[PDB]
Amino acid sequence: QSEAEKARKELLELEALSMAVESTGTAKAEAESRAEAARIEGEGSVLQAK
Amino acid sequence: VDQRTRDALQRSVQLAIEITTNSQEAAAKHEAQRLEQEARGRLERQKILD
């Protein structure tokens, strides 16, 4: 179990790189979508107010 | 001289035999259990390396 643990530390630190991706990628995606929609509304509001 | 003494000595050897048959059957079982663990040690480590 000391041998099935020196490798299991390696399986764990690779899951930490992978879980970084699933989380930073998900939050990056839902936030850049809201920033783009609000830019369209913002450039239109300048014209609409003109 | 007496026969019933020779019987009492006859059951003495029937035991002596069973004492050596029990010792190989216990020495085999301890080797079976040792190898069965040398595989499990690798089969469990191999799943983690996959």
- Resolution at which this structure was determined, Å: 2.7
DSSP letter (8 states) at residue A7: T
Give the span between the Cα atoms of A12 and A4, in whole angstroms. 12
Q: Which two tokens stand for residue A26?
A: 């998900």
Give how far Cα A22 sits from Cα of A4, A10, A26, A31, Å.
Answer: 27, 19, 6, 14
Dihedral, B30, B35, B40, B43 alpha carbons, nearest 10: -170
Which residues, at least 6 apart from A3, have a Cβ–Cβ distance to it below 8 Å?
A: B41, B45
CB contact under 8 A, B45 and A11: no
Give the span between the Cα atoms of A27 and A34, in whole angstroms. 11
B5–chain A nearest CA distance, Å: 58
Give how far Cα A33 sits from Cα of A29, A30, A40, A41, B1, Å.
Answer: 6, 5, 11, 13, 110
- In whole angstroms, how large is the CA radius of gyration of chain B? 22
3-state secondary structure of B1: coil
